[PDB]
Amino acid sequence: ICPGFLQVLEALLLGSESNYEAALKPFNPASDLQNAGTQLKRLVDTLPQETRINIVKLTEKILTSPLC
Amino acid sequence: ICPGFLQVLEALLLGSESNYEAALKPFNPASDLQNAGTQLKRLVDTLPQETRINIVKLTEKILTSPLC
Numbered sequence: 001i002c003p004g005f006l007q008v009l010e011a012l013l014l015g016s017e018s019n020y021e022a023a024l025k026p027f028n029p030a031s032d033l034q035n036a037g038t039q040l041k042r043l044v045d046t047l048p049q050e051t052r053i054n055i056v057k058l059t060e061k062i063l064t065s066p067l068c
Numbered sequence: 069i070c071p072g073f074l075q076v077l078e079a080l081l082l083g084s085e086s087n088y089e090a091a092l093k094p095f096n097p098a099s100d101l102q103n104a105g106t107q108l109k110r111l112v113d114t115l116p117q118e119t120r121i122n123i124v125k126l127t128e129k130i131l132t133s134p135l136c
């Protein structure tokens with residue numbers, strides 16, 4: 001799952017549209033499910049710039065939190 | 069990283085607030101980084117109900133996509 005998911009990590013924060021949904025193509029998200037992923041991208045293109053590098057530089061401290 | 073991250077998966081979609089930030093406590097997200105995680109929760113409490121079970125039932129089809 002690590003590999004199949006980054007194309008969405010960028011299409012989500014480092015993307016704007018077309019790459020996020022097209023990135024979900026290989027995942028063939030259910031109907032509504034995909035719908036939620038589309039808006040998921042909007043919320044990303046609706047925040048400032050620091051909030052962008054933040055959730056991107058934040059999801060790492062929450063998931064891949066270095067240190068112990 | 070699989071384990072340390074679900075407390076946020078629920079605090080994010082199955083949560084509203086306090087559990088999401090408090091869930092990031094153990095991850096000690098940087099300053100702004102955490103800021104982005106706070107709004108991250110708002111965007112979740114700002115969508116309908118199907119969009120909620122969707123991104124939750126969607127992030128699985130994108131990441132843990134069954135089948136091949």
Ligand SMILES: CS(=O)(=O)c1cc(Cl)c(-c2cc(Cl)c(S(C)(=O)=O)cc2Cl)cc1Cl
Nearest residue numbers: 008037040055058059076105108123126127
């Ligand atoms: C399935 S999806 O593509 O619609 C999706 C939706 C969300 Cl909310 C996140 C997400 C997940 C988390 Cl945990 C955070 S955070 C690092 O702010 O908690 C931010 C975001 Cl945008 C990630 C993805 Cl890939």
